[PDB]
Each structure stands twice: as C-alpha cells, then as structure tokens.
Design an enzyme around this catalytic site. Sequence first.
Site, short mmCIF file in Angstrom:
data_model
loop_
_atom_site.label_atom_id
_atom_site.label_comp_id
_atom_site.label_asym_id
_atom_site.label_seq_id
_atom_site.Cartn_x
_atom_site.Cartn_y
_atom_site.Cartn_z
N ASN A 1 -6.03 13.99 -14.99
CA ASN A 1 -6.69 12.86 -15.63
C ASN A 1 -6.67 13.04 -17.15
O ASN A 1 -7.70 13.21 -17.80
CB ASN A 1 -8.12 12.72 -15.12
CG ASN A 1 -8.84 11.53 -15.72
OD1 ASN A 1 -8.24 10.50 -15.99
ND2 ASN A 1 -10.14 11.68 -15.95
N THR B 1 15.28 23.31 11.52
CA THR B 1 14.39 22.23 11.92
C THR B 1 14.97 21.54 13.15
O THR B 1 16.16 21.25 13.20
CB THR B 1 14.20 21.23 10.78
OG1 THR B 1 13.77 21.93 9.61
CG2 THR B 1 13.17 20.20 11.16
N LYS C 1 15.96 18.55 15.37
CA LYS C 1 16.39 17.19 15.15
C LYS C 1 16.60 16.50 16.50
O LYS C 1 16.89 17.16 17.49
CB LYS C 1 17.69 17.14 14.34
CG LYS C 1 17.62 17.87 13.01
CD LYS C 1 16.60 17.24 12.09
CE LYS C 1 16.62 17.91 10.74
NZ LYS C 1 15.54 17.41 9.86
N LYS D 1 14.33 14.16 13.81
CA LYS D 1 13.05 14.44 13.17
C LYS D 1 11.88 13.97 14.03
O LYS D 1 10.86 14.66 14.14
CB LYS D 1 13.04 13.76 11.80
CG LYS D 1 11.74 13.73 11.09
CD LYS D 1 11.98 13.38 9.64
CE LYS D 1 11.46 12.00 9.32
NZ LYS D 1 9.98 11.99 9.30
N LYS E 1 11.54 25.31 13.58
CA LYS E 1 10.35 24.75 12.97
C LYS E 1 10.20 23.29 13.36
O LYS E 1 11.17 22.59 13.62
CB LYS E 1 10.39 24.87 11.44
CG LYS E 1 11.59 24.23 10.80
CD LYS E 1 11.58 24.42 9.30
CE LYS E 1 10.49 23.60 8.64
NZ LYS E 1 10.76 22.15 8.72
N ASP F 1 9.59 19.53 12.32
CA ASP F 1 9.79 18.75 11.12
C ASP F 1 8.46 18.54 10.43
O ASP F 1 7.40 18.56 11.05
CB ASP F 1 10.43 17.41 11.42
CG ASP F 1 10.92 16.72 10.18
OD1 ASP F 1 12.13 16.79 9.89
OD2 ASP F 1 10.09 16.11 9.47
N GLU F 2 8.52 18.34 9.11
CA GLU F 2 7.31 18.19 8.31
C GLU F 2 6.41 17.08 8.81
O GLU F 2 5.18 17.18 8.69
CB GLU F 2 7.70 17.93 6.86
CG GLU F 2 8.16 19.16 6.13
CD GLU F 2 9.52 19.66 6.57
OE1 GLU F 2 10.29 18.88 7.18
OE2 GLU F 2 9.83 20.84 6.30
N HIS G 1 5.81 23.65 3.09
CA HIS G 1 6.78 22.67 2.63
C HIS G 1 6.13 21.81 1.56
O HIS G 1 5.06 21.24 1.77
CB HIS G 1 7.26 21.80 3.79
CG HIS G 1 8.14 20.68 3.34
ND1 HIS G 1 7.64 19.46 2.96
CD2 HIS G 1 9.48 20.61 3.19
CE1 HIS G 1 8.64 18.67 2.61
NE2 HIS G 1 9.77 19.34 2.74
N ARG G 2 6.79 21.73 0.41
CA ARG G 2 6.37 20.84 -0.67
C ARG G 2 7.64 20.31 -1.31
O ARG G 2 8.30 21.03 -2.06
CB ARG G 2 5.50 21.57 -1.69
CG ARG G 2 4.60 20.65 -2.53
CD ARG G 2 5.36 19.90 -3.60
NE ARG G 2 4.53 18.89 -4.24
CZ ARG G 2 4.98 17.95 -5.07
NH1 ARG G 2 6.27 17.86 -5.37
NH2 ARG G 2 4.13 17.08 -5.59
N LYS H 1 23.08 21.16 -5.66
CA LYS H 1 22.79 21.12 -7.08
C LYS H 1 23.96 21.66 -7.89
O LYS H 1 24.77 22.45 -7.39
CB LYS H 1 21.52 21.92 -7.38
N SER I 1 17.34 24.57 2.48
CA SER I 1 17.58 23.61 3.55
C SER I 1 18.58 22.58 3.05
O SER I 1 19.47 22.87 2.24
CB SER I 1 16.27 22.97 4.02
OG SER I 1 15.65 23.75 5.01
#
Lengths: 455, 455, 455, 94, 107, 107, 9, 9, 9, 9, 9, 9
Positions: free
Chosen positions: B114, B164, B166, B168, B192, B194-195, B285-286, B325, B370
């Site tokens: 803020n 993950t 699948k 999802k 895992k 999925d998120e 996970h973020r 990347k 991932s």
Amino acid sequence: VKKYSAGVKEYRQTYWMPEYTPLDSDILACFKITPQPGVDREEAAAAVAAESSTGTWTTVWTDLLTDMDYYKGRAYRIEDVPGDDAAFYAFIAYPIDLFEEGSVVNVFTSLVGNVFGFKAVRGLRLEDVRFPLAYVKTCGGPPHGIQVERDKMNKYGRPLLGCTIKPKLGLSAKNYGRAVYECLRGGLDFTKDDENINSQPFMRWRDRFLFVQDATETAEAQTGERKGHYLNVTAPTPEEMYKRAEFAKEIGAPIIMHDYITGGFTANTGLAKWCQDNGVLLHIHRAMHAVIDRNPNHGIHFRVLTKILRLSGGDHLHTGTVVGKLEGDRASTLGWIDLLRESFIPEDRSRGIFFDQDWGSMPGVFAVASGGIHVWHMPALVNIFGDDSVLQFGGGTLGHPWGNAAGAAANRVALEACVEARNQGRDIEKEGKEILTAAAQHSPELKIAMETWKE
Amino acid sequence: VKKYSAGVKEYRQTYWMPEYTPLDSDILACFKITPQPGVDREEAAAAVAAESSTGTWTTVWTDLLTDMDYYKGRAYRIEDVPGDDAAFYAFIAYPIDLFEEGSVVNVFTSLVGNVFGFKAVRGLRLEDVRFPLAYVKTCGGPPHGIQVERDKMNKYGRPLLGCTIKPKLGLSAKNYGRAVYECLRGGLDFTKDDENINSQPFMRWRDRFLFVQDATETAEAQTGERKGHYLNVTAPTPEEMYKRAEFAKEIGAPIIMHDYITGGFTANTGLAKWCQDNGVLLHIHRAMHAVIDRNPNHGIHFRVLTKILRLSGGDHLHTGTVVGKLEGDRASTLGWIDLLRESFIPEDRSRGIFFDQDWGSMPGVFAVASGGIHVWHMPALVNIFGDDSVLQFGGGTLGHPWGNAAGAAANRVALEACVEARNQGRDIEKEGKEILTAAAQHSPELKIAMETWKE
Amino acid sequence: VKKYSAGVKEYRQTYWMPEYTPLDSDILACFKITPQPGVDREEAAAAVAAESSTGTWTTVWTDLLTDMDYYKGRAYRIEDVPGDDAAFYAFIAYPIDLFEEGSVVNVFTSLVGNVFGFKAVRGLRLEDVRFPLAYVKTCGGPPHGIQVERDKMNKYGRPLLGCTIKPKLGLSAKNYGRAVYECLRGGLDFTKDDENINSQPFMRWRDRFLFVQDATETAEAQTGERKGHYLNVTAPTPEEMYKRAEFAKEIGAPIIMHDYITGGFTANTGLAKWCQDNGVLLHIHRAMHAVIDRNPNHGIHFRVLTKILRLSGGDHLHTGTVVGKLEGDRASTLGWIDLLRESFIPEDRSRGIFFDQDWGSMPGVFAVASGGIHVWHMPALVNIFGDDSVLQFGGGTLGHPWGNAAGAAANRVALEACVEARNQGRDIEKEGKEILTAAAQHSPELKIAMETWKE
Amino acid sequence: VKKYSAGVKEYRQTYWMPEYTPLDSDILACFKITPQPGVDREEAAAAVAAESSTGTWTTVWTDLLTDMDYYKGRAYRIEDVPGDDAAFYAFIAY
Amino acid sequence: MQDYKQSLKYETFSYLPPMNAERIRAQIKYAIAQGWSPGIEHVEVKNSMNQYWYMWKLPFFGEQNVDNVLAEIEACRSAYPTHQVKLVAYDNYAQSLGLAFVVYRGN
Amino acid sequence: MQDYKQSLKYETFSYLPPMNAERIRAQIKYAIAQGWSPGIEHVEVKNSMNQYWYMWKLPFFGEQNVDNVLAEIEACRSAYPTHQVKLVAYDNYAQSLGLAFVVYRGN
Amino acid sequence: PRLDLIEQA
Amino acid sequence: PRLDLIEQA
Amino acid sequence: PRLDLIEQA
Amino acid sequence: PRLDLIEQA
Amino acid sequence: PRLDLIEQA
Amino acid sequence: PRLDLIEQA
C-alpha cells in the site's frame, strides 16, 4: 479423439468451439490475448482454454480415461479490442465441475495463476469472469453485508466516517488508544489500524486491542453513538490470526480488519467464516493499482479481484482513492461500486463488464474511500459513493490544526452538510464550496479545516 | 521537528538522509522510482520512504508523541539506472522495529503493498530487499531444507525426478492413482497433484489421498526406492488446509504441496510450521512471470518473492521453466537458484543483486524445473540446476508413446546418463545429443522418447 | 513472644534451641557456617535457621498471627569442623510442614537458595540434608530403578556398557545413526546423545530420533541383545520436552535422557513422572564439580544434589569420572554410590554422611561412569561401581583404530573378562593388566585397544 | 584436519585463533581462566573453547563428518587481569 | 508398443547398464576431486531400504588414491559376498552424501 | 583397521569367550555366596528377547550346592536340547536378578 | 554445500 | 437497495 | 539391595 | 528512555 | 454413465 | 486448635 497418439498437437480442433453456447452453470472468462506472431487467433484462444483446463503441451494417454468434451475449457467467441489490433478478446467457458465449491481463487489461479501460454500466446489479461449463480451459492460471501451491518451499528441515512491512525507505525499502545479515543469522541464512526499494524515491538497486538477497546467504550459513552475500531488481526499464521480475532470478540470489539494482500485468500476466507459465526464485522483491505491491478495490458483487472473479494467475504472493501482519479475512470469507479453492492449487474462494455453478473441474495459490501482526502473532497465523495460507503479520513482528521476531536468534528459536519444538501435536491458537487462554506459558519472546526487544505 | 504545524509538507527534510549509513539490523530496499515530472529525485525517494513507513500525506500531531528519527524509513542513496534515464534507484533503510517478527510479508506489504506515491512518484518497482540476519532468525524458513530432505528420502547424487499428473483436471481418484502408480514404478522419485487439483466433484480430496498413497506404497515396494507424491492441501479455509495435511500425515504421505498464490502467505507460513512439527516435506508452487513478476518496470521482482518464499517456508519452490528462457536470463536463472540454496549471496549488480543477503543457517530450498520439458532438455537442466533440484516432467512422462512407466524410465535413464557424464568431466550441454544417443542404445524407452519430441 | 515490638532483634532467643531433639519427621540440615567476626556461633546458627525458615531481618507483627514455635527452623547443635577453626557445623531442624510435598527443591532453595546471612554469617555451605521417610514417600523418585530396568532390558550379571557419540556436535542425523549402529552392533548396551545435542541446525531432533531408532532396531536384530540409545529430550520449553519424549515413545525408543542442569528441576520431575506413566527409562545427566559442587567451602555438596536427583527421579545418574579421582576421594565415591542405590544409608562422618538417610522402598539409581576412560580403566571401574552401574566409553569406543564396532567389542570383552575374573575371586584391580592381557589373546580388538591408550 | 588419527591431542592448533575477528552474529564470552601449572595460556583458552563447543578429550572420527572450522568455538584473544597474575581473560567466540 | 518390465532398482545409476571398472573408477575420481570422503556400506539384500546399512570400517577420510577405495570395495565384498555393497561419498560441508551408488547388487 | 563383525549377543558375559565349566562354576559360587537363589530359564532361540522365558521347575531357593545347580542345567539341556538356557540368580532383597547369563546359546 | 559458502568463509 | 435491482426485476 | 539396608533392619 | 540510548543514536 | 447423460449433452 | 495438640508439643 478415441485413440492414443503421442506428440505435440495443435489445440484448435479440441479447444476452439465457435458453435458452443455457454451453459448457465459455466464459469465464463474474457481474456485479452496477444498471440505470438504467426499464430492464428482461434489457435491462441484454444491454447489458453487448454492450459487453463484439461490441456497439456503434448498429448497424454490419460486424456482417454475421462471425457474431455465434458471437462475441457473451450473458447467459444473472439472479438477485436476497440483501440488495439494486436490483442483480441477470447471468451472461454469452463464447466463448473472444474472447480472446488466455495473456493473462488481455485477458479482464479486455474484461469491465470499458472497459465503461461503453450507457446501460442505472448500476452494475457483476464478482463472479466462470470461466476454463475450456482457457484456463487457455494461461497460464504460477506459475513454480514451492508444492511445487517447498519442494523448492528444502528447507523442509517449517511456514509460512515472512518480514519486510519497516523503515523502508520511508531505509536505505543496507550498513545494509539489516545488517538483513537480523540477521533471517536469527535464524531467518527470508526477508526482503524493501519494495514501494516500487526504486532510490532513498539506496540504488541494484545496491548493495542485492550487500549483501543477502552478508547472505543469511552467515546461511545461520551457521544451516545455506536463506535468501532477495525482491529487488524492479520497475522503470520492462521492460529495467530484466529487468536487475535478471538481476543477481539472476547473484549467486545464489534469489527476487525484483514489485509488480504498480506494474509491471502485462505486466511481471509477462513476469517470471514469465523466472523459470521461470531457476529464480528470484517473490513478488508486489498490495494489495487498496486503490483497486480495497475498495468492495463498485463495482469488481472480490479473488477475480477473485486468479485473474488466479495465471494471470499468482507463487510467492507478498500483499495485506493477515487476522487483523485480522473473523470474518465469515474465511470469505472461507479461500475466498481455496483459490483460490490448490487444484486444483479447487467453487461456494459463501456464500464468493462462483459457478462451479466448475478449475485442473487449474496449481501453487498461497503465501498471504502481513502487516500489523501479532506473536507473539500466530501461533496464529490458523497455524490460518487452514496450512503452505503465508508469515507476514511486518516490524515484529514489527525492533521487538523486543533487535533483529532476537532478534525473528526470537521469531517462529520462536512459529511452531514453534504448529505443534508443532497437530500434537499441540490447538486452537491457543483455547489460543494457553498455547501461547506455555509456549514462552516456554524462549525469553527470545519472552518479552519477548509483553511488548512486547499479546495 | 518539535512543534506541531498542520498542513501538507515536503518529505525531503525528514525522509532523505544522504549521510545515513544503514545499520546491520536495517531492512534495506532498492526501489526503481520514476518520479512525477518536475519532482526532484531526492524528494520522490523521500516520498517513498515516508509512505512505506511513518509518513502521512499531511502533517499529523501524533508524530510528536514518538521519535520519528528512530522509526522512520529514510532514503540514503540514489543511483541512476543503467539504460533508463527517467527512472532512478532509491535505497531506503527501515529500522527492524517497524515489522512483526517472523512475518516477512508484513515487511513486503509495508514496502509496496500500500504505497501509492504521496503525489511525488509515478512509477515504483521493488528490485531487492536486504533482510538482516537478525530478522531472518525470527522466520521459520524451510521446514526441512535440502540436506534433511535428502536424508529423509535417502536420495543422493543426482537431481530428483518429478511429474505432474495430466490432464490437469478431470481424472477420478482411482484413475489418478493409476497414473501415479505407473509413473512411480517407472523410475520417478515424485509425482504431484496439479496446482489446481484440490477437491473437485470429479475427485474428492480424501479419495485422491487414499488411492495416491496406495499407489505410492505399491511402487515403492516394487522398485525398492523411496517414492512420494505431493498431495495438494491447498484449501478454501485454514481448517480445511490443516485437515487435509493431517490426513496426509495420518496415511504416511511423506510430502505435501501448497499453491502459495491460491493459499496466501498466512496459510503457507502456518502450513510450513505444521510441516516441521509433523516431519512432512512441503513443496511450494508460486508462479512467477504471472501477474506479479513479469512486467520489467512495474511490480515486484521474482528474487524478492523468492526470498519471501524461503523465509515463509518450503522445501521445494517452483515458478516457471528455465531452459526455454534465453541465454541472457540464464545468468538471472543462476542467481535465482543461489538465493534459494546458498547461505550467503554476495552483491552482484549483473545478476540483479543489490545487497549481500545472509541466510546464516537457514536451510536451502530445492529449485524445481517444469514446463514443456522432455528428454532433450535433460543436459541443459542438469547443467543449470545441478544436483539440488527437482526436474518435473509432466507431459514428458505421461506423453510417452508407451505410457507412464516407460516415460518415467526414459526420463530416469536420460537424467542418470547426464549425471554420470557430468561426473566423468564431460561438457554435457555441448555433448548432450551424443550422451543421450549413447544411453538410448541401451534404453528403448529413451530411444522412442527422443523420437517423440524434437531435439 | 506474645506482644509486638518493632525493630531489629537477635535470633538466638528464638532460633537456637540446644535442647531440641529432632522429630523423625523433621528435615535436618548440616551447614558449615563461618560467622562474621565477633558474632557468636549460637547467634549465627540461629541466623541461618531464621533466614531459611520463618525469620525476618526485623521483627514483623505478622509473626503473632501464627505459632512460630511450631513452624520455625531451629538450630539444635553446633560442632567444630575437624581441620578448620573459623567454620563450625550447625545442625538445624525444619518441620516437615514448611515444604511442598513432592517438591524436594522447595526444600533445597529454602535452605540455601535465598539464604544470604541476616548480617551474622560470612560463609555458608550445605553439607548434608536428612529427608525424613515421611517426605521421601511424597516424591516420585526413579520412574523404574535398577531392578525394573534390568528386567525391562533383560540385562543381568554385569555393568551395562554405554557410549556418547562423538564429536559432541556437528554430525548429521544419518551419520549420527551410523555411529550409533556401529557401536551397538559391536557389543555396547547403550549409546547416547551428548548432553548438548538437542535440536541443532545440523541435526534436527526428529530426524535424529528416527535414524537412531532405525540404528537401534538393526543392531538389536543383528546381535540378539536388547539395545538402547538415550534420546536427549532436553528442550527450551516443557511442551517441546514432552513432545520429543512422546515421539521417543511412539517410535519404540526404550530410554531417554535429560540434562538436569539445562532443563531444571521442574522439567525433570515432570519428565520422570511422564516416564513412569509411559514405561520409558530415564537417564539423568547433572555435572558435579562444575559451578555448583566443586568449591569445598562454598556451595552445595554433591551428595545433597545426589539425594535431590534420586527424589526428583532418574533411572541413571551421571556427573563426572571416578577413576581419575584420587584414592582419597574414592571413599567419597563409594559413599556417593550408596546414596544412589541403597535403601538405608547409616551415618558415617568419614564419608561425609551426617545423618541416617532412609529411602525405604524408593528404587535405586544406576551410577554412571564416564570421562576419558578406556579399556585400561575397566578393572578399577568394575571394582568400584560393581554390577549396578553403566560404564560409558565415548572416546574409548569411537577412538578405536578399527572403528566403532571394534571399539565396542574391545570394551565389551574387557568388561566381561573383568566381571568373570571378579566372580572367580581374583583381585581384579591388582591383577588388571594380566586379566586384560589374557583376554586380549582371544580378542584382537581388545589387543590393539590396549596398544592405543596407555595403561 | 582431513584424516582420522585416534588419541589425545592438544587443543591449541584447532581452538586458538588469535587472528579471528568475531562475526556480528557470534556469541562472545569472556572467561577468567586460571590454568593448570605448566599449561600455556593459549592452550588453556583453547581447552575452554573446545569443551564448551565441539571438543572432546580425545580425537573422535565423527569430527570429520562435519566442518569443525565453522562450528567450533575458538578463543581469539587473551588479556591479563588487572590485579591478579595467575588468572587471565580469554575471549571466545561461538 | 513395448511393455515395461518391473524390477527392483538400486537408486542412482541403477537405470544405466551395470558399471564396469572404468565407470566405477571415474565416479570415485569425481568424488575425490569434489573433496568428498569415499566410504563403503553393505547390507543384506532384504534390508536394502533401511536407513542404516553396515558401515565397512570408517569412511576413508582424506583418501586421495582411487585404488585404495577399490581395494576396500573388494575387501568388503570378500567379507560379505552375499551383501549389497554401496559406495558413498561424504560431503562434510553439506553433511550429506555427495554421491552414492550400489557397486554390487548382492545375492 | 579391522572391520567389526556383527553377530547376535546374549547379554552379560556374551562378549567374553564362551565359558568353560570352571568359569560357569565360579559364577554360580558367586551367586550362592551373595545369598541369591539360582534358577534356570530356557526358551526357543527366536523368542530370546521375550521378558518371560520358560522357567525350569522352580528357582532353587536356599540351594547351597553348586553341583546341584549344574546337574539341573544338564537336566534342562536334555529336556530342551534346542533351547537357549540361562542361569539366573534371584535376589529377594532387591526383587531383582543379581546375575544372569546364557550357559547354552541354543540351536 | 550448506557451510561451504558462508559469510564466515 | 438489496432487492430493488434483482435479475428477477 | 532395596530392602537389605532399611531402617527396619 | 527506550529509544534515547539506542545503538542507532 | 455419469457424464453420458448430462444436460450439457 | 490445629497446632495446639501436635506430637511436637
């Protein structure tokens, strides 16, 4: 597809359904998509539908264990954006079965949380989300809402007045309560902790709660009006959050606040359920036009976040100031207000509303105005927000040359003069100065407040 | 200032201290500030220091009740940005007393949550934050960290392999467990949720936990290697989150996961404390480069968010893919990795590090890779992430033409061939194809995997 | 005294009762008092009786509300110290009503905790304390004691062998368990945490407990003998202490340890009650000749502390080494042993025992020998401590040139050769070398152990 | 030390670091130490640093499982006591 | 489509073909060059999932000669010819194993 | 460096070489001289860790003749030639065993 | 790892 | 308010 | 032990 | 008191 | 069953 | 009462 064939495939043939009419139960989403160069719009829209639902970057054999046609998200319409040409609007429908009941962010993070592109999209932005009534009914929503809050506090016929204690940090608990007491006895309905006042070395939370509650009771006895102070229960852990909320209830505090940004959805949703179970009003702060909602072509629009906050639950909602905003975004301010308070919001592209949003019986939320506002803003504030709002004057009250009580009275006089003038049929924004000047003839506090800050 | 004078004032004289040397206990922040036209840099930096600490848009009398000189945030240095000219770097120090111990977001939202501008700043971006060791010691941090996690799972000498499940969404619990069982028995260390797999109508969470745990035990018995599945405990309320985590522990699940975006800081911090109390590994996970961390001139940089997630607590951390990347951001990938795993990160402007970050004894966090990665990515992944990482191949495993077990084996063979080649001194990124081709001579699963997706 | 007269008065007329015969229920204390110059012995003894009971530095009117004659501590005899002339022995009786039942330190701190002198004493030292049987019956005492411990572990006919894992700090949990496993499989009955191994960054307590318990079960299966490892539950808070003890019980650990110095009486007494309720053996470490019990004219003698530790509760008790001590203090070593293990200890000034101590049915405690001891010490250790003892060889085992298992075997062979020789009637201390040399003919491990450290 | 050699050793070479500058995070202690006759001050200060931290009366092989240089307490300065001569001040960092 | 054949595995490198002398030697060279101390663990086949295998003697702290490690592997083999034998490399900076793999799968 | 060989043990004196007749006799003499009552327990090898072995007849309360104890050890051996056999010595003052050791490790 | 790259080093 | 602007209306 | 050396004895 | 004698001062 | 006869179908 | 008739008296 009935047979398994490994390998990367296009998404258009599964996830682009231009003939699909959304079911009333579908979660609808409007994305502003800028596709990778060369990629067709129908393919990129299909890519976003795939990645936000049942799609994988390569074909998986486990798809054949279920029925994709039922479960998949599917883009069903594409529209140009008025102004841009690179971007377009994708409308994607999601079967309600994709989401956990009463967990509206599970909708949100599925949609945009972890949706990178499948190599077909170079820019994504979630503009609007139609939450079907069937899904709305599963969410807790505001623990009390506007009408019940007015009944509990016995406040009718005007916006409520609030004030954040300043300085934001640094005051001891007893000095904090002194500031609160002086504001409340001067005519404010509420005071509040700053969003980042939790439990610091200079002021531990339990000491603050005790002194503030003593301040609240004292000012209530000396004014004959109900008073409150938003005690900030935002905490590092849920146990700590609940403990502070329990202590607030134990000492009779009518209202608490939660910084949604700090705390997060899970904490907030749990807190809102707790508040309904314990009859405590809940003020929510979630800064918008900050990190998340400011970039116009990258991020989640604040009206989607507003819908989430209403479903997650809060009796008040605050983001940023509205008067300093330009007349252009005032139409977006009015649309923001309606999503908070109304039962049914019709579609209106001019305000950024792409779907009819039906809330049914879900209670409305008090809209909160803050920022560097003072008495001169009061006519515009009353005109824009109307009665079902909380106008918070932090610096505008504690920055009065005669102290908090006088500052509170100045704001209280200005507010009531504007409300009375509005009820008399006067155009209070056009006649604002004259309304305040006349009321200032009987209120020396208001008179010097108008001399302290500029029209 | 010893005397009260109401009215708006400049911030330069209080909040700009060019001669201030930061104390070792100070929270330091580096902001990329674009000031409003006409406003001097020293004033705008002072404005950000004021609004993120003890400043108000107008002078308040309550400032005189405390000592501002001790409590205020104060900008102490300004630097040009290499490339831009509109922006500049403001370095602002915050006394550690401003923040709740063990509540690192209370630092974060105070800084940028803020902080709108005080009418002197038109653009803000938090680049780096120096958390002093004194503050670090108050945070829970990872419940176990790299070394303890390797000891608990008895895994040494290579990156861990995950996947993950699948699609999802859409699989029943029993079919979910089938997919998990097939992956685990094929050579993956972990699978895992999925998120956004929480508790949906097609698969209620308790049924999923039971079938997955049965799948995990079966594959562990049939491989002789420890196995795990990140059970997603992300939930609408903290009670529900804890209940699912408790059930995970009750049935012997070694590891759980939490979507930090969905859940939020308060839930995550509480969950991480719970995990340390109950000996359960915690995968976080973020998503970064999503809403918050993608815009290069507007928002919070991912390295600040990385520091927060380490303090909040997690044994694994995942955002997005690293190989896709560009080589340019690979240096930023390597710096990201070090903030997660190392004890002391020296300042390095080339990597975006503006302060020495000392973690002391706080455990490191497994970095997770991932995305749409498959066998061909394995050489680059092993070279970039090294051993203390988890390489998750969702589609790369379930998209194998011969099913999950074969896909898991292909990835497991590729990983071990790359690790063995690295240990032999070979440049595995340059020799990647030859390494995989040779290993493919003995692994038909790997051979057809390399034919399924492109080098 | 029936009437109130304010003012400072002498204590001789109230607190010196040379004709007082102690009741069987009286707590008796023997103080070595060096009075301030000029002050008579009877007055100084009266001063210590007053300050450690119902006395005040000045007359208070509230004395007349109760009967001092019943409640006061009263010195009843004075004796010269054999050797010194400045000091003397004061024998003071305390009515049992002065103390909380089952709270033996409340006796201790009343006696010397806060007894400064009333300006009549320049030197105080608590030599012995007679705890009457009536008071003994109120204390928990050892949770199991020697006989039950031997029955639970199925160990008969010899001292038990233990070993602290070395280095004291720095080992990971898995490496800790490796060291434990190797020692236990080599012939030791027990291993133990070092006193300051609690839950450090290099080894969290839960990981240590798990790996140690796995090590204990493995070595027990491979030797066919019961094994244990003293898991250190010493913790910063009682909740944390109980939690670790509960986890020890949950995983089947037969024995835990507690550092009485670190933890304190309250924690230890609670832990000992917990251990009896849960069938867990309790090893106590309390360093003597360290801070408290080393100064011969200032402090509390170790035999008083020994009595306290037996009443507070422990199945084993360890302070320091006994063999390195001189032959002179060996008589004090033998008296120390008897206070731990016997039911009735008669008065014996030569050993420092000023009162008959009756324990009744309170179980005895295993005496523990440690220090820099190795195989060559075994004959003296067996002769001094006898069968009801634990001989701990930390460095003597892990410092063996062939590793822990061989070191454990060397100590185990040496111990059994000494026990067998003792049972054959040989004077094992005089014939120690020959006994070990003969046993070394059949045990290469013992042979090189004797070559590693000096006779 | 990289290799295991059993036996009693002196503490001076590990636990006496006269060139050590304490970190801001170090627990610092000041001991008034009276050494056993014949024992050098640097050795006795090293002995207190060893016993109050990672030291053992004899060399243990488990030291090589961790990094002693990071974890050990180390005496870093010795000062005379103003008045006494038998005693000295040892400054030890943990 | 080929069917995946389930068999017991032995953690790191057990999915590669079994190591010859040169491949084993190269891994030990790597561990020594990293400054890790080679060690040897062994266990009965049925107990291979225990956290604590039998340690062969002590870890060869500060061992620089690969051939010494190989000789001790052979010595451990002869002493327990039916045991699984694992080569570990202790990393005292991380207090972890930098590397671990089974050199003999036991019988 | 020598490797320590793991084997099952039998509590007190099992780390010494196995006892001949004179060493066993001396221990029984010690137990009798302490005023303890010799007794004999036996159990199947796999149950050796039970708290309650089979008691051979009753403890020989007030037995003074070492040869009687030895004869009863032999009798118990013949009756259960595959059982582990333990000599115990009851101490009624402590209600504990003053001494206990395995005289036959069973088969 | 862990203690290799400390500020202490 | 509340029921003035319903979808029902 | 235990009851050998009692005050009763 | 409290903040008069800080290390910061 | 389950999703064969949906209103969606 | 209470302490008037003690065994101590």
